[PDB]
Amino acid sequence: MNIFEMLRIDEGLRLKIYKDTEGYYTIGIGHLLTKSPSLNAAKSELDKAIGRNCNGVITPDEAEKLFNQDVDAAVRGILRNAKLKPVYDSLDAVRRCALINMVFQMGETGVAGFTNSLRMLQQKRWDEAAVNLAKSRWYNQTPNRAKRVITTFRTGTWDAYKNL
């Protein structure tokens, strides 16, 4: 199991514009287009991102290309981030994947706001951090995915996704 398979499980794959859990215009594999209410704002961001007139629809290939960019931008974002880098460096390969997952979903900024949890992960206090991470809007809004991520941090194994 790898970061790409993990996120493919968490986000799904949709080839036509859609609304994400938050009501935002998304496409592909969790690719946020715009937080704006306008479907036209969406198709516009869309064509701009793909470089063609897509009219709300993309191919599998385009969806994957976007997925590649997003994952890459998530990893470099963590690496350049002064709050995030130290945590990432301190983690093992699987828990690394879990933080990447969070950054992909909530952006760098939102993850860096989880101060206390970050502190616990860095200290390798797994159970403590699991319980702290669950006390968030994140967990309340998307509990099944949050739990899967939390389990990944708690155990350091892919058990949660082995199921799926």
Swiss-Prot record:
Compartmental location: Host cytoplasm
Protein EC: 3.2.1.17
Active site: 11, 20
SUPFAM superfamilies per the UniProt record, alphabetical: Lysozyme-like (SSF53955)
Keyword Hydrolase appears in the UniProt entry: yes
Domain of life: Viruses
Known catalytic reactions: Hydrolysis of (1->4)-beta-linkages between N-acetylmuramic acid and N-acetyl-D-glucosamine residues in a peptidoglycan and between N-acetyl-D-glucosamine residues in chitodextrins
Role noted for this protein: Endolysin with lysozyme activity that degrades host peptidoglycans and participates with the holin and spanin proteins in the sequential events which lead to the programmed host cell lysis releasing the mature viral particles. Once the holin has permeabilized the host cell membrane, the endolysin can reach the periplasm and break down the peptidoglycan layer.
Similarity comment text for this entry: Belongs to the glycosyl hydrolase 24 family.
Name of the protein this chain belongs to: Endolysin
